[PDB]
Amino acid sequence: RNLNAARELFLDELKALTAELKVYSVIQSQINAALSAKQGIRIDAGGIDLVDPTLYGYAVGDPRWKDSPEYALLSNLDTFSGKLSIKDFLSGSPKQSGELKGLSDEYPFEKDNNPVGNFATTVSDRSR
């Protein structure tokens, strides 16, 4: 009952967080690259697909991918469509970091008040 239910709850809860963190880790990579190159970033369907098993150490076709915490988290977002863009993920529910709305498909690099920079900050705040 109570101790063991709690134990299972926490184990599951931890897997969820670990998955989400791993996703935000991939998203933070993309951003950091754009910042390093002084370039813009595309977070729409022209950016990377986050429902790629290879992003999480699984080969394509591996049947266990479908049973992964990553797939569990990603496929249950209201934005999931088989694919899932950065924007889809960030604006998708339910996840432990909530939702970002008013997201644009593209953030251009600009010398002053860098859009990509402002994107980086808000994602950074969510991935913490």
């Epitope: 970091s97 909530g98 709305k101 997201l103 644009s104 402002n118 808000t122």
Partner: antibody, heavy 121, light 108 residues
Framework: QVQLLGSGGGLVQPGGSLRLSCAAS????????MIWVRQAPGKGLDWVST????????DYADSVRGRFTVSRDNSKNTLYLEMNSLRAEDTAVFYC??????????????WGQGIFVTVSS | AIRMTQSPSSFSASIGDRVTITCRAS??????LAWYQQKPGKAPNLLIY???SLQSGVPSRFSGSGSGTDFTLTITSLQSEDFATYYC?????????FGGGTKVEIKR
Amino acid sequence: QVQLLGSGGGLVQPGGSLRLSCAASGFTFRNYAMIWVRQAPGKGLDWVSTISGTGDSSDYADSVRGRFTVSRDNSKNTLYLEMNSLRAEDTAVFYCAKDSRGAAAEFFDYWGQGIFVTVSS
Amino acid sequence: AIRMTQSPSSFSASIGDRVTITCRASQGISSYLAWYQQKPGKAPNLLIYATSSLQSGVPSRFSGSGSGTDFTLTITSLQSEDFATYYCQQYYSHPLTFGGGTKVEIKR
């Protein structure tokens, strides 16, 4: 100075339409997600809609879904709220507001002065 | 909607009083809470974001704290020009929701 000059308010018949307008200056508008907030007489603040910087994404409170449309003109630096099928309950002051940081709609450092909407026959 | 329950809905205090406004969320919202001041017949002004980051230009007598579900706005030394209505606002998720507001009045 940062400014958001609102207009397009006023008196309208029940069932009628209005187009609220908010002209932005003093910041690079196209880099800020924006919101509309309403405040009914003697009531608190209610979020109405959100629009992304480029205007390629928008969200709405369930009560205005379908009958309100948010839009923006980034060349002219204008924010719009088209309002149709208006009800007495829509009578309120409307504020446009810019996100502090811009990339998403979260918390809002600049708010336009309220636009009065009265719905009455 | 994440419901934000603000309390109290109003109070009177003397100048110099320390005053505390409470905001409770219907679910966890981590730190994604902000506070606004609204002087009568004016648009709101941002006081605090991220639970406790003070907005540039705001006096330090305003401070925010909380975690998850319970949030507080403190005015540590109330002044005559603090007469306003104060709202909390969550931004953990959409729709963005605001507290009912606390009207602060001033005894003299």
